[PDB]
């Protein structure tokens, strides 16, 4: 019964434990022009993951936390 | 206004008695809403999910968890019912609605500038006392069929109707006797729970032997075999490539046939020990040979198992492996280095059962079963997801009688008598904790309330008659659901499991304690 | 004071989406609502005088016809309530085959008069526990009710007078017709052993020449060609092989490793010298005829054409194994040449042209065989489903009469029957459960009002007229289709029956489907979300 | 078009106004969670962003959770994590201590005293606070058992777990004793890796107890396997018992027909070596930190031996820890020395729906599972941080026999004794030294405050208390408010977690006292 | 209004059978006229 996700409680288990200095947060971008600078920076090995949100809709907090 | 919110404008914070309105209204609304369940007579709720699922229930855990709710008291208590569930497996609305009472009676005094310390003190004392009592209560007996039979009753008659219910305790209680080995834990993976859908809710029945959901995948093996060796193995009988990455190579046709022909020798030389012990073992036609393999057999295999009248079934469960070990009596194999008739199990007889395009296996008349199978029927899911659970719980139920050497009387008498012992023991306790051992013993006294509420009786009078006949006469009376008046649980068969009762009390006290202590919720981890 | 708000407790706590309805008034009523209404709008179909609905799904696709439980499956139906009268239907379809409006409209009648007597002061428990001391007193009244048994299986006179009934619902205008051709080919089928098979009968549908045209072939049919240039074989000698006709190749990987000019020069020389001699090993067991259920190497078609070996490719491995049950054939998993117990025959196989459409004919002279074939003709993609529609029922039928042989009168003979027994049974029994086994009895009527609806007379001089004649002592009569006034007649002089099995086990579901909705007296629905499908 | 000097999204504060905004900044935080100490607190409920809840009343896990815009609320965060990794006790009380030192800094920076001065002022208070808190000490004798568990219990006593107060000392007490640990001359105890801590929901909290071994939540692999062992000879391991390609790339090349079968044939040769090397020092038990080959099964079953994989790697060493054996990866290397001998019983038994095993009886273990069982998962989460902080101050005070009277004892005592030092400063700096010195009176003053008692006569009371000779040790009854010598209630705290929230708290005060610039906005500039 | 919305009920059940609006109207009407003939029958006089 491997695909019924038993080690995907102990993966939560060990996954609360963050860090110690606190968690930080994900961080925002405040314009168009913002989004762009910070986008043609850095090297190709970086990876950028962005989200598309707005307030109040269902789904944002759930995986903005994850 | 909040320091929380000073540092954190977009915070929400809720302090000193906002906090305690807040846990007590969720609190509140869960009781209100888990009323309806508690007892034979309560009403049963349906739950459609998000892709339309229907989902009809009854049990506390159930509704918690399939119910739209999105706060955080809800939250503690749901995270309560469901260790309630997990471990004891019976007694999740219960718990919620002792909580709810819990939680309403300590606010009816705090709500009077009261402490909730005080009211704390006054719930573990009255904890104490009551566990005391319980312990004093509780009924000692062996626990023969007649005791197993009538605790199945007294859950499945909750968890469903009357006839089914009755075939259920029957069914829970011969497949826990026929696991159940002397002065050993009860091991409930034994029973396996297998689902059809094509008769009557009322048609299930337990099969003294096992039931795989998968049948034989060659057209000319045998639909149905008398006389059976059973060989449980966990080898691959299918074609494996070499780990380090092989390949062939060749200069003609010939050649190329040839490596065609030698390249399945490996799978071909356990077949051909298979095929061998099977013809040792049996050299007549009277006994058949089955072959379980927990890995996949490709159809080279099967052709060559099947031209010897060998039945042979792959991927079969990782549990069944154990399953029919205790159930046929062989041995499972990882490899065919030694194979010996000593590891061949043994069954009266193997057959195949087809329902549209799912093929099921049987594999029933063993000599002395130690794994028995239920076979859940019903004309729909939802009536297979009820009785399912409803196994679950009578299982669980009937698996805590036996390992508790006890039983506690039901319909409600022993929450009467754990209160009216607290408000005889009240002025033993010192201080304004009295008031807590009160609240407590009136929380206690929800269990008769609701069940008076749910059956349509009257319900301050139904409680003030059974308080006044168990004070009279100091027997264990509890609440009769037909007419009201009172009636005495142990004589009857209404029984509770000691255990649920134990951990009832602990849970409930603990989380009351914990959630009245609480002076600010706060969610500042945003910004 | 302009707002109501929420009341403190669930109120507040419940979801955004989500909805809860409680009560008797929110809940109970609003379904046995809804199921009034599914059953509204499968009512009109039932009976010979059913009408076809026209059906589009989410998808465009058109479907036409009265069958009460493809109407169902095609509809998107999303009430709960109606779902589990819905999958009721559907599960009364999966135990018999026919009857799925009846469920439907036992169901709606079951819980209109339940609605109707929670109203007047009855409560749900009582009204259930009346619904099933009726239920159990009908099953007990049934077996009392069958006029006559099969008698016959084999005969095909006897077989197609039993099924005209089934078909005749459905396809009212040409019912004997079809009798006719589902008669034979379920005689052919079905042999000295007891057991039936539904799957082994084939339907083919070749649009083109009219319904009437239609006929059973003893064998089955694949709508192909050949590979090879022999298109007829007159004493077919098939030898089937799952493998695909090519030389077979290594599993892990394949590496031709020239290290001299030699074998370079030989290598495709004796590839082919290696295919030839296969095919004529093939060959020259006496096989001309040879189904593969993979692909054709060029090399093995041009050595089996010039061997004269008709080649037949088969995609689905379900036509494969149907092909080897027909011909008798074993599927061989390599390309070794037959030995005579897994060597096919048939009578004769041949490339045909009906329509416009090129099939691949397997058949047999002799009236026996494992699988036969209906070929379907119409002038309507349409017309040739609702056909394979009935064409199913008919064989359901037959299946459930192999299963069991009582047949009980139709034409709402039975239900009028059931509906006074129960009736003058609820009269004698004093208390509460008298009224719900009086609505029980009253919820049959719904049968024969049906019929009389649909056939456009009036109703309730048809119940009248039945009441009278079953009072008087016939048991055995219902209301007659071939007239435009109000008559009955008896059913069993017409032949108008229709399984016991079939009767036993609709009541029951439908019976447990209202029971089981009226059970229900809290609804918590989550947020519709997405589920698609 | 703009010329602009700094980028346009720069801000910059600077004047008085900083100072103010730090200080109330720091106020804030302490007024977070001033509520929460004493033996009367009250529980909070977090909202975890990820969708969890933490109900506590510790410090710590309280300011953790809280995310702030103010650096300065930052710069105390990372003070209450500093106080809870350095001891593990005290960190309620450094917050409120920081708080109270920068309020009373700010009434000077009101008038035109310069930081300097003050933090000049501030560090020779922390000195002499050190100085009176190392005098007014008393030995402790920790081969006396009922003394560490009275150390614990009046640690334990202002959490949720105080009601189990035996119970949990003991479980702390047995746990720290039975993971200190010597070896070539060095003295550890190292808590954070052994001694785990394992929470099952459900049961009764008094069935908690801390095991003479490891335990974890594993099966065996087959179920022929034994799930029941007297005396077994555990083997460890960390590679796997399967066949695994090489580093380098190794293509093989078939011509021959009986090459392939022999490929095969040798892998399997190959498991039965590896098999066969295992076997051969007769062992009962065999854990693996990685996967176990079907064929590997089968051979250790043929030899009776119970299996376990895909165990992780820091149980493998807390079982190696318990058990006295040595992990192996080369079974062919293995020898007796590494077999483990010393474990009394191993038992696989169902707990719940799942399956434990119990490495339970073993002789001198270095190592131990607290079990704990309890209502649900937050329960067990607060009762694992109360553990956590009784451990912590077992630990400190088996490193430090130290201690210091409690209940705000130890901090009248200290303030009195600087108040009579200051007498002879005779400069401008003894206001500051006063004023911080005094402002130690808030601990007593909030625990007042939370047992709900009258602050100013209490507090008074116990000011002319503490002047005369021989009352360092008199402090205040959190629980019911009176005045009481805490050599008869019987509280005391290790000398370590005073001295580290004194220091601490001194030190944050001089860190945020040095700032009066606030510029922000500018990017990280990697 | 609760009595008219019990005559509809009521006349609900015909409509669904088969029936024209006009002959429930008929007897609605003689029902209505035999009302009040059985109310004025049963009637008692009061003295002001
Ligand atoms: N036949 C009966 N007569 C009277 N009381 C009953 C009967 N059966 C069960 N009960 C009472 O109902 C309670 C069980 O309620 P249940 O719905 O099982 O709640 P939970 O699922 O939380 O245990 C028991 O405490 C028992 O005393
Ligand atoms: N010639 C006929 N005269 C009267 N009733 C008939 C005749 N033929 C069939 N029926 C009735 O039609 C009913 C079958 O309805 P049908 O449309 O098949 O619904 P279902 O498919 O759900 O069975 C049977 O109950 C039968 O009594
Ligand atoms: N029984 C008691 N009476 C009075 N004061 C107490 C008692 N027990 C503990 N204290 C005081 O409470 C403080 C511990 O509070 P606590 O909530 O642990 O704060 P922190 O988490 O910062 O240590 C200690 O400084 C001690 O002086
Ligand atoms: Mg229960
Ligand atoms: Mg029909
Ligand atoms: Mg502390």
């Known amino acids: 019964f491997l695909q019924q996700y038993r080690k995907q409680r102990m993966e939560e288990m060990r996954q609360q434990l963050h860090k110690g200095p606190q968690f930080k947060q994900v961080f925002e971008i405040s314009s168009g022009e913002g989004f762009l600078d910070m986008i043609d920076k850095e090297q190709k090995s970086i990876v950028i993951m962005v989200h598309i949100y707005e307030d109040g809709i269902p789904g944002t907090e759930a995986m903005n936390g994850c | ?527 | 004071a302009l707002h109501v708000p929420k009341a403190p407790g669930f109120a507040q706590m419940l979801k955004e989406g989500a909805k809860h309805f409680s009560g008797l008034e929110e809940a109970v009523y609003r379904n046995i609502q809804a199921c009034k209404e599914l059953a509204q709008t499968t009512r009109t179909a039932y009976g010979p005088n059913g009408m076809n609905k026209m059906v589009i799904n989410h998808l465009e696709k058109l479907f036409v016809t009265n069958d009460a439980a493809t109407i169902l499956r095609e509809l998107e139906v999303q009430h709960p309530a109606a779902k589990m009268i819905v999958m009721a239907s559907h599960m009364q379809e999966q135990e018999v085959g026919d009857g799925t409006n009846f469920v439907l409209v036992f169901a709606g009648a079951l819980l209109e008069l339940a609605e109707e007597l929670l109203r007047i002061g009855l409560s749900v428990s009582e009204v259930i526990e009346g619904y099933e001391i009726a239920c159990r007193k009908a099953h007990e009244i049934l077996p009392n009710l069958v006029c006559c048994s099969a008698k016959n299986l084999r005969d095909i006179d006897e077989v197609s007078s039993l099924l005209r009934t089934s078909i005749m619902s459905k396809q009212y205008g040409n019912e004997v017709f079809l009798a006719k051709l589902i008669a034979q080919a379920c005689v052919s089928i079905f042999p000295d052993s007891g057991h039936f098979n539904v799957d082994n009968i084939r339907v083919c549908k070749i649009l083109g020449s009219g319904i009437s045209s239609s006929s059973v072939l003893h064998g089955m049919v694949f709508k192909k060609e050949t590979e090879g240039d022999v298109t007829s074989v007159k004493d077919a000698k098939i030898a089937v092989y799952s493998c695909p006709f090519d030389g077979m190749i290594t599993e892990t990987k394949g590496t031709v490793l020239i290290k001299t000019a030699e074998e370079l020069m030989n290598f495709s020389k004796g590839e082919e010298n290696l295919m030839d001699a296969q095919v004529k090993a093939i060959a020259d067991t006496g096989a001309n005829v040879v189904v593969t259920g993979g692909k054709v190497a060029d090399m093995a078609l041009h050595y089996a054409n010039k061997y004269n070996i008709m080649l037949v490719r088969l995609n689905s491995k379900w036509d494969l194994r149907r092909l080897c049950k027909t011909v008798g054939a074993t599927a061989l998993p390599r390309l070794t040449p037959p030995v005579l117990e897994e060597m096919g025959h048939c009578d004769s196989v041949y490339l045909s042209e009906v329509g416009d459409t090129q099939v691949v004919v397997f058949k047999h002279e002799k009236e026996d065989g494992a699988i036969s074939t209906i070929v379907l003709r119409g002038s309507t993609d349409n017309l040739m489903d609702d056909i394979e529609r009935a064409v199913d029922d008919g064989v359901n039928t037959f299946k459930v009469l192999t299963r069991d042989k009582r047949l009980v009168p139709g034409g709402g003979a039975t239900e009028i029957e059931l509906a006074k027994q129960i009736t003058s049974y609820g009269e004698t029994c004093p208390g509460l459960e008298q009224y719900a086994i009086k609505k029980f009895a009253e919820a049959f009527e719904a049968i024969p009002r049906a019929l009389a609806e649909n056939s456009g007379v009036k109703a309730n001089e048809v119940i009248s007229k039945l009441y009278a004649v079953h009072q008087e002592g016939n048991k055995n009569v219902g209301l007659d289709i071939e007239a435009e006034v109000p008559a009955v007649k008896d059913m069993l002089e017409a032949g108008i029956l229709d399984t016991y099995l079939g009767k036993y086990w609709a009541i029951k579901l439908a019976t447990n489907a209202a029971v089981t909705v009226l059970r229900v007296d809290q609804i918590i629905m989550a947020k519709p979300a997405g589920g698609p499908k | 078009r703009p010329v602009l000097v700094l980028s346009q999204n720069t801000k910059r504060e600077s004047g008085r106004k900083v100072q103010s905004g730090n200080i109330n900044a720091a106020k804030t935080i302490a007024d977070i969670i001033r509520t929460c100490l004493g033996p009367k607190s009250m529980m909070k409920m977090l909202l975890d962003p990820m969708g969890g809840i933490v109900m506590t009343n510790d410090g710590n896990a309280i300011l953790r959770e809280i995310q702030v815009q103010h650096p300065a609320a930052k710069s105390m965060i990372e003070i209450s994590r500093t106080q809870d990794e350095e001891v593990g006790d005290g960190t309620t009380s450094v917050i409120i201590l920081a708080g109270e030192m920068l309020s009373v800094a700010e009434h000077f920076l009101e008038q035109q005293m310069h930081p300097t001065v003050v933090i000049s002022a501030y560090r020779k208070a922390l000195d002499d606070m050190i100085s009176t808190l190392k005098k007014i000490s008393i030995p402790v004798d920790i081969s006396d058992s009922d003394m560490m568990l009275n150390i614990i219990n009046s640690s334990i006593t202002t959490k949720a777990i105080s009601r189990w107060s035996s119970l949990a000392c003991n479980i702390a007490l047995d746990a720290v004793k039975m993971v200190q640990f010597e070896e070539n001359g060095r003295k550890e105890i190292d808590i954070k890796k052994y001694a785990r801590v394992e929470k099952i929901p459900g049961g009764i909290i008094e069935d908690s107890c801390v095991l003479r071994g490891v335990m974890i939540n594993k099966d065996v692999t087959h179920p022929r396997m034994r799930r029941y062992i007297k005396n077994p000879r555990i083997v460890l391991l960390d590679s796997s018992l399967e066949y695994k390609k090489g580093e380098s790339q190794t293509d093989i090349e078939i011509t021959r027909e009986e090459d392939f079968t022999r490929i095969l044939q040798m892998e399997e040769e190959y498991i039965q070596q590896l098999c066969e090397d295992i076997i051969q020092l007769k062992p009962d038990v065999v854990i693996t930190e990685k996967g176990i080959s079907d064929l590997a099964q089968h051979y250790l079953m043929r030899a009776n031996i119970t299996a376990i994989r895909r165990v992780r790697k820091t149980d493998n060493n807390r079982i190696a820890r318990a058990c006295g054996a040595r992990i192996v990866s080369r079974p062919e290397e293995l020898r007796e020395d590494d077999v483990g001998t010393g474990a009394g019983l191993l038992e696989i038994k169902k707990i719940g729906d799942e399956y434990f095993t119990f490495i339970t009886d073993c002789k001198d273990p270095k190592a131990c599972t607290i079990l704990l069982r309890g209502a649900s998962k937050e329960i067990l989460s607060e009762v694992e941080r109360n553990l956590q902080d009784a451990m912590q101050v077992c630990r400190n005070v088996l490193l430090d026999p130290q201690l210091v009277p409690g209940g705000g004892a130890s901090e009248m005592a200290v303030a009195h004794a600087l108040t009579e030092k200051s007498k002879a400063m005779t400069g401008v700096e003894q206001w500051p030294y006063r004023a911080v010195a005094q402002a130690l009176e808030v601990i007593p003053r909030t625990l007042i405050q939370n047992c709900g008692a009258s602050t100013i006569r209490l507090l008074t009371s116990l000011r002319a208390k503490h002047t005369q000779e021989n009352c360092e040790t008199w402090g205040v009854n959190g629980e019911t408010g009176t005045l009481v010598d805490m050599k008869e209630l019987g509280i005391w705290e290790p000398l370590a977690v005073k001295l580290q929230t004194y220091k601490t708290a001194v030190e944050t005060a001089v860190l945020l006292l040095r700032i009066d610039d606030i510029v922000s906005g500018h990017k990280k500039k990697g």
């Open chain 2, 1 to 527: 206004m909040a320091a929380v919110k000073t540092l954190n404008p977009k915070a929400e914070v809720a302090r000193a008695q906002a906090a305690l309105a807040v846990n007590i209204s969720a609190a509140r609304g869960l009781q209100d809403v888990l009323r309806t369940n508690l007892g034979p007579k309560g009403t049963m709720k349906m739950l459609v999910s998000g892709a339309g699922d229907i989902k009809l229930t009854k049990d506390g855990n159930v509704l918690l968890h399939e119910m739209q709710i999105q706060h955080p008291t809800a939250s503690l208590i749901a995270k309560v019912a469901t260790a309630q569930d997990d471990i004891t497996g019976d007694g999740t609305t219960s718990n919620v609605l002792i909580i709810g009472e819990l939680l309403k009676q300590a606010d009816l005094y705090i709500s009077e500038g009261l402490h909730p310390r005080i009211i704390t003190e006054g719930f573990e004392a009255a904890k104490e006392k009551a566990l005391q009592f319980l312990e004093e209560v509780k009924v000692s007996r062996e626990m023969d069929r007649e005791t197993l039979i009538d605790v199945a009753r007294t859950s499945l008659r909750t968890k469903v109707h009357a006839e089914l219910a009755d075939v259920l305790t029957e069914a829970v209680v011969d497949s826990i006797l026929a696991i159940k080995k002397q002065d050993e834990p009860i091991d409930l993976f034994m029973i396996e729970i297998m689902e059809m859908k094509h008769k009557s809710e009322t048609d299930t029945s337990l099969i003294r032997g096992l039931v795989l959901d998968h049948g034989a995948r060659h057209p000319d093996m045998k639909k149905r075999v008398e006389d059976a060796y059973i060989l449980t193995c966990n080898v691959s009988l299918e074609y494996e490539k070499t780990e380090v990455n092989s390949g062939f190579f060749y200069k003609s046709a010939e050649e190329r046939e040839k490596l065609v022909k030698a390249e399945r020798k490996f799978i071909e030389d356990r077949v051909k020990k298979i095929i061998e012990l099977k013809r040792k073992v049996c050299g007549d036609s009277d006994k058949g040979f089955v072959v379980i393999n927990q890995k996949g057999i490709d159809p080279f295999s099967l052709d060559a198992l099947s031209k010897e009248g060998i039945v042979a079934l792959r991927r079969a469960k990782r549990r069944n492996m154990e399953r029919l070990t205790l159930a046929c009596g062989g041995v499972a194999l990882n490899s065919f280095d030694d194979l010996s008739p000593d590891c061949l199990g043994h069954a009266g007889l193997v057959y195949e059962y087809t329902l549209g395009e799912e093929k099921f296996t049987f594999i029933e008349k063993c000599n002395n079963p130690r794994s028995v199978t239920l076979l859940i029927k019903g004309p729909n899911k939802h009536t297979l997801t009820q009785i399912k659970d409803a196994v679950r719980d009578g299982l669980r139920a009937v698996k805590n009688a036996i390992d508790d050497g006890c039983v506690v009387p039901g319909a409600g008498a022993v929450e009467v008598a754990m209160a009216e012992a607290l408000i005889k023991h009240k002025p033993s306790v010192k201080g304004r904790a009295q008031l807590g051992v009160q609240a407590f013993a009136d929380a206690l006294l929800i269990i008769p309330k609701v069940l008076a509420q749910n059956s349509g009786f009257d319900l301050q009078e139904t409680l003030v008659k059974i308080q006044a006949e168990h004070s009279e006469s100091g027997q264990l009376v509890g609440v009769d659901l037909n007419t009201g008046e009172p009636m005495v649980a142990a004589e009857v068969g209404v029984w509770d499991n000691y255990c649920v009762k134990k951990q009832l009390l602990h849970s409930c006290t603990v989380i009351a304690t914990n959630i009245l202590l609480v002076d600010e919720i706060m969610r500042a981890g945003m910004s």
